[PDB]
From a paper:
In this report, we have describe a crystal structure in which GSSG is observed in the active site of an inactive hGSTO1-1 mutant (C32A), giving us a snapshot of enzyme regeneration occurring. Our attempt to determine the structure of hGSTO1-1 in complex with 4NPG has revealed GSSG bound in the active site and 4NPG bound at the dimer interface. The likely source of GSSG is the non-enzymatic reaction of 4NPG with residual GSH in the crystallization mixture. The GSSG dimer binds with one half of the molecule in the G-site, with interactions the same as those observed for reduced glutathione binding. The other half of the GSSG dimer extends upwards into the H-site and is less well ordered. The binding of GSSG is associated with the structural rearrangement of several amino acid side chains relative to the previously published complex with glutathione. H-site residue Y229 has shifted to accommodate the γ-glutamyl residue and the indole group of W222 has rotated 180°. 4NPG binds in the dimer interface, deep within the cleft formed between monomers. The 4NPG-binding site is largely hydrophobic, lined by residues from helix α3 (A87, I88, C90, E91), the following loop (L103), helix α4 (Q113, K114, L117) and helix α6 (M172, I173, L176).
Numbering used by the authors:
A (entry chain A), B (entry chain A): 4 to 241
The structure:
């Protein structure tokens, strides 16, 4: 119940309490899942306000003039948005093991892999609107090209994850789009990419990933409503 | 003469000497100017290899598989690309005053302003191909919308530059597209944005900006050839 989204007409929320940080999110948004994975991995005390993205509160544009999730707001009232920016902010502003490497080159490398990956979210957007078996074959091809590039990174590095043999920031940043791959009927696109397939399996075993994983059933329920343009999609299940 | 670009058929360059870093650049490329402004501002010893982007050396794709400038290569053979990534790398890997703030929020802010600005390079690409007075009026409008957003940042901050009252990373990252504004006949788009106009004037007074500024005459010579699709554009003037 408490997870229900805030939409048009809702009262603006109060101040974030000292000792917590707040994320404005939506339970099915992969960009916000990045930020939540980082919050979870670093053990950062936080609250979540879900936003009805189909019927947004007017006040939400005071949080982010772009009107998008994720957004962080801290107890000092500071606002941070763009998922990758929010993630690096958390890594720097909070204690515990650092998800990004301290080494400048290794850090730059993670950011270059993110750029390599950056076509995938737009492709997923397109697959979700694919109309027939002809479109779907073409989509499968574009994903295959993209996935072969990621395979090459793992091949060159000889490690299970993209930043080393332990999970790190870059893995959490790309994960949410792979999470949805099964549902979108694109789990055959990883057939030519064996290291990437192993990576997926290893990601699903990570405690932070597992804790935040959404079931096939729930994602499908959301997708059905989202594509029906329903103002209740964001609250699928409740 | 030494600044002449390397193109198809050129021998791959040798190793970068210990104590220097190398930038693969092109004298008229605004994305590479970012990196050169940072090299200059931090006093970093470096060499430049200009790339003929119309007729690229095959070996350049071993430096950057995307085939784009800028690219950094250091004496250890490490390769970094994407202009913003190269700039942050230099700020972290070399001594001297830091162009990016140490504070996580203030740093995240610079990155958010960069995202705010990020439509402008694609617009400049479009203006350069604008065909008549009707297209040009429409372009002027899109720039005006974008420039009003940047004006708002300076208004909210009450400082001459985008990261404070002293020049910092964010200013150097956005400067190269404003440098070209005069030439593109878009210097009237800043009429409604007075703080942004003052910013331009202050940028031109910066020693690092001034040292790297290209004259109206030379940019025009390059543009003329670039749009004529000439393999000699990159070496305009020599
Ligand atoms: N560069 C930004 C992008 C952030 C972004 O796009 N956020 C989305 C979160 S939903 S994540 C991205 C996108 N989903 C959406 O755009 C949802 C749109 C909303 N439901 C509406 O009603 O308009 C998507 O492709 N999901 C994959 C899938 O459906 O399987 C958002 O808030 N959109 C609101 C809007 O566009 O107005 C970042 O990295 O943070
Ligand atoms: N995201 C990357 C973008 C880098 C990028 O686009 N680099 C350009 C440098 S030229 S800077 C960007 C672009 N110029 C060009 O694309 C030049 C293309 C080349 N001359 C050719 O022959 O294809 C531009 O719009 N300039 C404004 C102007 O002309 O006034 C490049 O190497 N292009 C090679 C290519 O596309 O194949 C980054 O930030 O580094
Ligand atoms: N619109 C802009 C592009 C916006 C953009 O690309 N942002 C970066 C992320 S913002 C940069 C940053 O500061 C950062 C912080 C942390 C990490 N990291 O943790 O690895 C990496 C980069 C990115 O790689 N976007 C692609 C994506 O987010 O999928 C344009 O048209 O040019
Ligand atoms: N293709 C991608 C977008 C690529 C991208 O947006 N890169 C960042 C820059 S890369 C992030 C980063 O790590 C960084 C490093 C330094 C600074 N800074 O010094 O301020 C900021 C961000 C950016 O803001 N691009 C916009 C631009 O470069 O104009 C996509 O489709 O999503």
């Amino acid at each position: 119940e408490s997870a229900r989204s805030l939409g048009k007409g809702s009262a603006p929320p109060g101040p974030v309490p000292e000792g917590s940080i707040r994320i404005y999110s939506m339970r099915f948004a992969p960009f916000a899942e990045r930020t939540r994975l980082v919050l979870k991995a670093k053990g950062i005390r936080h609250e979540v306000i879900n936003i009805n993205l189909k019927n947004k509160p007017e006040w939400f544009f005071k949080k982010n003039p772009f009107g998008l999730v994720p957004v962080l707001e801290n107890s000092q009232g500071q606002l941070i948005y763009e998922s990758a920016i929010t993630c690096e902010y958390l890594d720097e502003a909070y204690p515990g093991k650092k998800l990004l490497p301290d080494d400048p080159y290794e850090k730059a490398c993670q950011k270059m892999i993110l750029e390599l990956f950056s076509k995938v979210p737009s492709l997923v957007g397109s697959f979700i609107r694919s109309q027939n078996k002809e479109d779907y074959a073409g989509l499968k091809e574009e994903f295959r090209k993209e996935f072969t590039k990621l395979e090459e990174v793992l091949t060159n590095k000889k490690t299970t994850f993209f930043g080393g043999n332990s999970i790190s920031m870059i893995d959490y940043l790309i994960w949410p789009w792979f999470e949805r791959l099964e549902a979108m009927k694109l789990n055959e696109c990883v057939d030519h990419t064996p290291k990437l397939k192993l990576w997926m399996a290893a990601m699903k075993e990570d405690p932070t990933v597992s804790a935040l994983l959404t079931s096939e059933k729930d994602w499908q329920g959301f997708l059905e409503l989202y594509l029906q343009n329903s103002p209740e999609a964001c609250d699928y299940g409740l």
